[PDB]
């Protein structure tokens, strides 16, 4: 009983779920669910068709191969979803008193097990969380009981007749109706067109002729590529790319050039003539954010027109850098296909719901510091009661000793005050009390009463204590900021003195 | 019951503990503990070195004088009541005290001493002293505390040493380790400053000084030159040798430190040691002066520490005319204040602390951040046949950086990688893995779809281990004590390698 979350268990009629299917098995699987020729051996499905589709790619070519499809499988009649709180077979069988020999999924398909936990249903399906960061479940079915499932087709990616994995990824992008929902046929065509025509452009032909066109050093291949990147960017095909990449130093020509040098150095002949091997090699390079226009938590390049421009620019740069630092046409063929595949992976990551830095236990990384709420409950300021709470914040830095100057805390007249007594900061166990003064009616600032430094080997725990004088709940009208502000070292941003700001974002909730 | 930790509670005869004491009370307090709301009480600790932390001039807490540490003993029998939570309201409920009477009034009554003292003549509350500390704090009811006898452990002021040196030399005893003589370091510093400013090339280089306000780039350029020259004098000879390779100790950082010092020290500030300390304590870059980098205190001999501080004193003096607001500071309060910050950081590094990638301390490297999700995750338990799971958090600070794979320990029998349950999830997208042994002690798992992390994209790497033998695992059987998560591919000494993100585990039995 300590192992079953009944809150997530239920019986249902015509229980449905989804199963990703690999190329070839799409039509065969509609015949019926059959085990092919250990405690957890069973048929696996999920409640999220979009997460199912990720199980659907050619296993001989998982990175770049073709995507099969998704089938929906339904049990006729009544089905008991038994949600389990732990994924250790031994543990389960004990706290349920099962045959510590019989495999767990062996036992789950027996009349006896179906009797005990079935609640009147014809069979049991186990439910576990799909993954960390996911709200989906994975369903584990017994292979005998699975003989009863009807199999309808949800989608077959092969039928859609699109290039690469475009079908699978445009499917997954439906999950978000924000949302990067790009037409990759449009982007592929625009890309081809822009490459072809940029090649025929006068200043580009001109700038190519100036190329050492032979093996050289990274330092000068990089210099040339930076020059090629500047002139290329001046042509009308790349006018919008020029405008969106002029400010953010992540998108500068020097990073395009470093990318291009790095691709050209690692792509041999064996590699270039295979999409799977190409993708694997490219997938371990740093700096891809430069080409994607992804930085600071945002996909900036989010229109078909600007993505194809960026990919076209990058395709030419690889072409130029290959004779300078390489070893061989790939720049227009396998390179473009592989990099489109990588765009799709990363766009999909950003489409999926996720906590930003400084939310829940996701670290906030800035100026060499790393700061985070110690547990999920710490990031929650409970409301609607008279009294006290504590909130732990972890704090360190990557290398040398960097200071912590203090922390800015939210206050709300009557409902949220800084317990100045219990608020402190502890550095490798050394407990440091704080002097807290109010700035205005909504912000208190606490400073350590002896110096705080963190670094490699030196971490701090910032303990914030809140007091509530009323039991009236906080309403949104009442609170401006949603972050606690830990202040690092003092710097001069904009001819003016400021502290590095390490932000930890809280949620106001009731019990 | 649910609120009291029997295991850390006990009755003791002549229970003693320690109390830090401010200047002007080291003698007063020995006459007796008198009071001069829930937690209103007298505070002591089982750790006399932590107690020494509370001994500093409350009006000058950064830099003021340290008072002393006294030992306080109850005669007869005393109950130490250790509590699992620190919320007064929770306590009173789960123990059935009155929700009106404050906790530290309740605990000093015969009704509480009857019910909770196990026969002792009074109760003391024990709570954990701080995160990252093994000490406890004791909360003594004030009236009961009248029975305490008070003996002197140490009076820092009678040592008659400069600054806070007596306090910090006492604290350094905890590790029998950085145990420097600051009297010696002060004297060597005075001496080296005095003889350096009379050296020929130093006087020569001081003539070349603009000796007027100039640009920050200009003064930086000048100070780097002064640094090179000074470092060639024989007073700094060993310093020259130790700061030659590591770029954190380069002259450009000394230069940057001195520039930033001069820019924040105005006249009010230079004339007050507490204000100078306040201002210096929030500057970046001090680790260059302290010789502190990569988790280690490099300058750990009195001669080298004096050399670095002497050098910095001179540079501060040269830098003030070029970006300043005032020059006796560089040898008066600057050296006093910086000696103090030295002592703080040294003390941090003397205290036991988990290093990056140990337990839940993050490993920060090449823009990534990785950590064991929980303390238990970092533990590979042994002594049974079966399975365990281990979660590792992964992200990066800005652009998408890849995760190539992970290297995992194996042992022919006592430990194999469970390739079914081992996986990696990226903002919820579950990614199966291809694992291939690399010898008999190291398996390498690759993601079957590309993995990138970055601002707003994180991964959970789930490692599943299988044990075939109940036989425990022995120290010899296991080569590495770390799990290797591989970042992007880079070149180091003409060879390709992945960024290495290390998570250090401990092997243990269970109970």
Author numbering:
A (entry chain B): 3 to 39, 48 to 187, 200 to 350, 354 to 536
B (entry chain A): 3 to 38, 48 to 187, 201 to 350, 353 to 537
List sentences from the manuscript:
Protonation of key histidine residues has been long implicated in the acid-mediated cellular action of the diphtheria toxin translocation (T-) domain, responsible for the delivery of the catalytic domain into the cell. The function of the T-domain is to translocate the catalytic domain across the lipid bilayer in response to the acidification of the endosome. Remarkably, such a complex task is performed by this small 180-residue protein without the help of any additional translocation machinery. Formation of the membrane-competent W+-state occurs in solution upon acidification of the environment to pH below 6 and is accompanied by structural destabilization and partial unfolding of the T-domain.
In order to further analyze the putative pH-dependent structuring of the TH2-TH3 region, we crystallized a full-length form of diphtheria toxin (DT) harboring the H223Q/H257Q mutations. Notably, two crystal forms were obtained from crystallization solutions at pH 5.5 and 4.5. The first crystal form (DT-DM-A) was isomorphous with the aforementioned WT structures, whereas the other form (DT-DM-B) belonged to another crystal form. Not surprisingly, the mutant structures also form domain-swapped dimers and are similar to the WT structures. Interestingly, the TH2 helices in the mutant structures are well ordered in a similar manner as observed for the WT pH 7.0 structure and could be modeled on the electron density maps. Interestingly, the Q223/Q257 sidechain conformations are distinctly different from the H223/H257 residues in the WT structures. Moreover, the acid-induced destabilization of the T-domain’s short helix TH2, previously reported for the WT, is no longer observed with the DM. The latter is overall consistent with the spectroscopic evidence presented above in Figure 2 for the lack of efficient conversion of the membrane-competent state in the mutant. The replacement of H223 and H257 with non-titratable Q residues suppresses the ability of the T-domain to form a membrane-competent state and disrupt the bilayer yet has little effect on the protonation of the other four histidines.
